[PDB]
Design a protein around this ligand. Structure first.
Ligand SMILES: C=C1/C(=C\C=C2/CCC[C@]3(C)[C@@H]([C@H](C)CCCC(C)(C)O)CC[C@@H]23)C[C@@H](O)[C@H](CCC)[C@@H]1O
Length: 253
């Protein structure tokens, strides 16, 4: 019912987050030529044996994800209050939310035109087949695509988008966090900002939208778990480490 105006602080928080995102997410995907080249081997049959023996798309996707983790670390460091946390808690939050924030931020390149993540020309267009070529199974990819569509249909304003990513990162319910109270205080500040923003730009669906966004955060936890299970399997493949990156190995190891 009540639609309070955004406070000076809330406006500042949003401005900071938008700026942080603009500085850490390149919508032109101009750095992609620097990643190891994508290689797409003939695997129309979706053979797990062939996929694991080759992992043809893994070097490229590992680089893309590693690159993205670095950008997420930068984004996170710009989240108001994040610096107030101990280095220990910052690292715990980053490592635990990295893959989730990547899935969230990738919605910007995701397109419902053909259900793909398009980052420019055909070379940098990723579909389900490309992810299976990196060693993952439909058990993860299909729910992820479903997640991308659901998120895409929320038609989030960039303000809502960056707040959602910040809230995802600053979560007190991450295993290993030491000062859950401080983290919850920061998250509440961000959550209150989001709730206020939604009510200001969306008439009472304001309540429906916030609930839907929070549900996406729950969906991300499940996706995170499935990815971890599959990463474990992938790591068993001999010589897989060389196809990944040091950051990826640490974050998901
Ligand atoms: C990374 C990003 C992008 C796309 C994300 C994709 C498309 C390819 C397969 C991925 C990467 C999924 C995959 C299941 C994870 C695999 C990771 C390993 C191999 C380590 O298990 C998770 C998200 C999926 C492009 C762009 O929007 C941002 C980047 C440019 C601004 C964003 O930051």
């Amino acid at each position: 019912s009540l639609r309070p105006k955004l406070s000076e602080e809330q406006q500042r928080i949003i401005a900071i987050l938008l700026d942080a995102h603009h500085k850490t997410y390149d919508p032109t995907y101009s750095d992609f030529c620097q990643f190891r080249p994508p290689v797409r081997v003939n695997d129309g049959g979706g053979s797990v044996t062939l996929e694991l023996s080759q992992l043809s798309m893994l070097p490229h996707l590992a680089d893309l994800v590693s690159y993205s983790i670095q950008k997420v670390i930068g984004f996170a460091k710009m989240i108001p209050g994040f610096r107030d946390l101990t280095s220990e808690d910052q690292i715990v939050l980053l490592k635990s939310s990295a893959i989730e924030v990547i899935m969230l931020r990738s919605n910007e390149s995701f397109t419902m035109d053909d259900m793909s993540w398009t980052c420019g020309n055909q070379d940098y267009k990723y579909r389900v087949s490309d992810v299976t070529k990196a060693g993952h199974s439909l058990e993860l990819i299909e729910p992820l695509i479903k997640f991308q569509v659901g998120l895409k249909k929320l038609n989030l304003h960039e303000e809502e988008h960056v707040l959602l990513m910040a809230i995802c990162i600053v979560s007190p319910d991450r295993p290993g966090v030491q000062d859950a109270a401080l983290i919850e205080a920061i998250q509440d500040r961000l959550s209150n900002t989001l709730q206020t923003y939604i009510r200001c730009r969306h008439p009472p669906g304001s309540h429906l939208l916030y609930a839907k966004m929070i549900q996406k955060l729950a969906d991300l936890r499940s996706l995170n778990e499935e990815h971890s299970k599959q990463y474990r399997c992938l790591s068993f493949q001999p010589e897989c480490s060389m196809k990944l990156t040091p950051l990826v190995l640490e974050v998901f190891g």
